[PDB]
């Protein structure tokens, strides 16, 4: 019963704050150019102890053949997909807290569930973008981001499962 | 040489004495002076009675003293450093692609599974993928070559799973491919291992010991490749020559693979059988 | 001259993901509306 | 027609299928189609490595 609400909320704040922290730092920890870490925006050294704007997607030594550097490198730049996960998750918790009251038996829970799982898809796809463009160790809050996507996925499972539960109550009492 | 000399005194019946030469050198004729140093300085200048030591016999050395029949035949040998790659255990399995790749594979795995389940439960009487567990199971069994057990009927299920085969083909076939070409070449090829190869490179330095018959050989060589080798060694910076053999040992050991050492087969194979077994 | 193996696939196949995997969601999305089509 | 086409794609890729012809004629179709699959995707997978 209410276990759906519990797992739902703890998934919301869990994967949400986890995605935020993932945006914060600890996304890639390795030797810099000398070792440092970076979170896809600006790297911070151990001179040592300061930071620098590191998401310089263009670098002044290349060839840039045809839509490879521009399109892909730009896509990885500004971290669009993970921000898409941010907005979509925001719609997740917001629309579930909306599903608290204002009954609307069928549409809302299913909707937020859909945009929520697909939000997870945006998260994983974004991770793919990041690991891709980066071409040695990873940051820990990176694992926090992936784990956030996972817990999100399970939360969506419980979501849709609760939705079809409501369908079972309605069609059940229909006879 | 201790045991050998002992046997020689046994078969010759006399008293002897073990004496190390002061400079610790083979012996070489100082140019412009006609002066021999080292053990050659010992016998040539009447200071020693006989030499029983790892002494190379050359014509110029014959030209001043006498020699017996050689007891151990040998030749020039090349010493370098060696990379020691341990044969991995469990990791030998997941070797070919990458671990992060596998993590992404898990990602798309659980993702596809979930989405398919949404294809099942939505749109209300029940179908076969009505449960998450069976759908996940389908994803596994499709990922492997194991067979299907529950064919998705919905057009959306069929298309998603279709994409999922369009994935399993490339990913798994690729695995068998790189593993195939990976376990078919086990002969670890070295970076560079030859003399002419050292002549055709400039990254790894190489030199010999001073006051040694080796340096004489190279200076008297007429081989084009060897002439060039001498030409580089004689003027390379800093001096490619050392004072002791162990100096060359620790020199190559501490050269990070950037300095090769020339020396006869005997010492080379001997040190090669010694700890830390690194050359 | 100054100018003179068992590769390990790392990110070449990555393209396969970030289009085809995307299509995954697409296969659902319109379908989903397609679903609420009939119920409508 | 839809289920048949699905047997087509699923037939081609390494996956098997649950339904199978029994027309004592279309068995030939599925046969030759398999025998095409083997050479095609086998050649492909063999090529992929290098």
Curated annotation (Swiss-Prot), chain A:
GO biological process, one term: membrane depolarization
Membrane-protein topology: Multi-pass membrane protein
Protein family: Belongs to the PMP-22/EMP/MP20 family. CACNG subfamily.
Organism: Rattus norvegicus
Gene that encodes the chain: Cacng2
GO cellular component: AMPA glutamate receptor complex; cell surface; cerebellar mossy fiber; glutamatergic synapse; hippocampal mossy fiber to CA3 synapse; postsynaptic density membrane; Schaffer collateral - CA1 synapse; somatodendritic compartment
Biological role: Regulates the trafficking and gating properties of AMPA-selective glutamate receptors (AMPARs). Promotes their targeting to the cell membrane and synapses and modulates their gating properties by slowing their rates of activation, deactivation and desensitization. Does not show subunit-specific AMPA receptor regulation and regulates all AMPAR subunits. Thought to stabilize the calcium channel in an inactivated (closed) state.
Disulfide topology: none
Annotated compartments: Membrane; Synapse, Synaptosome
Listed GO MF terms: calcium channel regulator activity; channel regulator activity; ionotropic glutamate receptor binding; voltage-gated calcium channel activity
Name used for this protein in its record: Voltage-dependent calcium channel gamma-2 subunit
Top-rank lineage group of the source organism: Eukaryota
Keywords, alphabetical: Calcium, Calcium channel, Calcium transport, Glycoprotein, Ion channel, Ion transport, Membrane, Phosphoprotein, Synapse, Synaptosome, Transmembrane, Transmembrane helix, Transport, Voltage-gated channel
TM stretches of this protein: 5-25, 78-98, 108-128, 144-164
Subunit: The L-type calcium channel is composed of five subunits: alpha-1, alpha-2/delta, beta and gamma. Interacts with the PDZ domains of DLG4/PSD-95 and DLG1/SAP97. May interact with GOPC. Acts as an auxiliary subunit for AMPA-selective glutamate receptors (AMPARs). Found in a complex with GRIA1, GRIA2, GRIA3, GRIA4, CNIH2, CNIH3, CACNG3, CACNG4, CACNG5, CACNG7 and CACNG8. Interacts with GRIA1 and GRIA2. Interacts with MPP2.
From Swiss-Prot, chain C:
Gene name of the encoded protein: Gria2
Domain notes: The M4 transmembrane segment mediates tetramerization and is required for cell surface expression.
Name under which the protein is recorded: Glutamate receptor 2
Domain of life: Eukaryota
Induction note: Down-regulated in the pyramidal cell layer of CA1 in the hippocampus by global ischemia.
Post-translation changes: Palmitoylated. Depalmitoylated upon L-glutamate stimulation. In contrast, Cys-36 palmitoylation does not affect cell surface expression but regulates stimulation-dependent endocytosis. Ubiquitinated by RNF167, leading to its degradation.
Other observations noted: The postsynaptic actions of L-glutamate are mediated by a variety of receptors that are named according to their selective agonists. This receptor binds AMPA (quisqualate) > L-glutamate > kainate.
Tissue: Detected in forebrain. Detected in dendrites of neuronal cells. Expressed in the pyramidal cell layers of CA1 and CA3 and in the granule cell layer of the dentate gyrus.
Subunit note: Homotetramer or heterotetramer of pore-forming glutamate receptor subunits. Tetramers may be formed by the dimerization of dimers. May interact with MPP4. Forms a ternary complex with GRIP1 and CSPG4. Interacts with ATAD1 in an ATP-dependent manner. ATAD1-catalyzed ATP hydrolysis disrupts binding to ATAD1 and to GRIP1 and leads to AMPAR complex disassembly. Interacts with GRIP2. Interacts with GRIP1. Interacts with NSF via its C-terminus. Interacts with CACNG2, PICK1 and GRIP2. Interacts with GRIA1 and SYNDIG1. Part of a complex containing GRIA2, NSF and NAPA and/or NAPB.
Coiled-coil residues: none
Lipid attachment locations (S-palmitoyl cysteine): 36
Bilayer-spanning residue ranges: 13-33
Entire protein: shown range: 792 to 840 of 883
Family affiliation: Belongs to the glutamate-gated ion channel (TC 1.A.10.1) family. GRIA2 subfamily.
Subcellular location as annotated: Cell membrane; Postsynaptic cell membrane; Postsynaptic density membrane
Known role: Ionotropic glutamate receptor that functions as a ligand-gated cation channel, gated by L-glutamate and glutamatergic agonists such as alpha-amino-3-hydroxy-5-methyl-4-isoxazolepropionic acid (AMPA), quisqualic acid, and kainic acid. L-glutamate acts as an excitatory neurotransmitter at many synapses in the central nervous system and plays an important role in fast excitatory synaptic transmission.
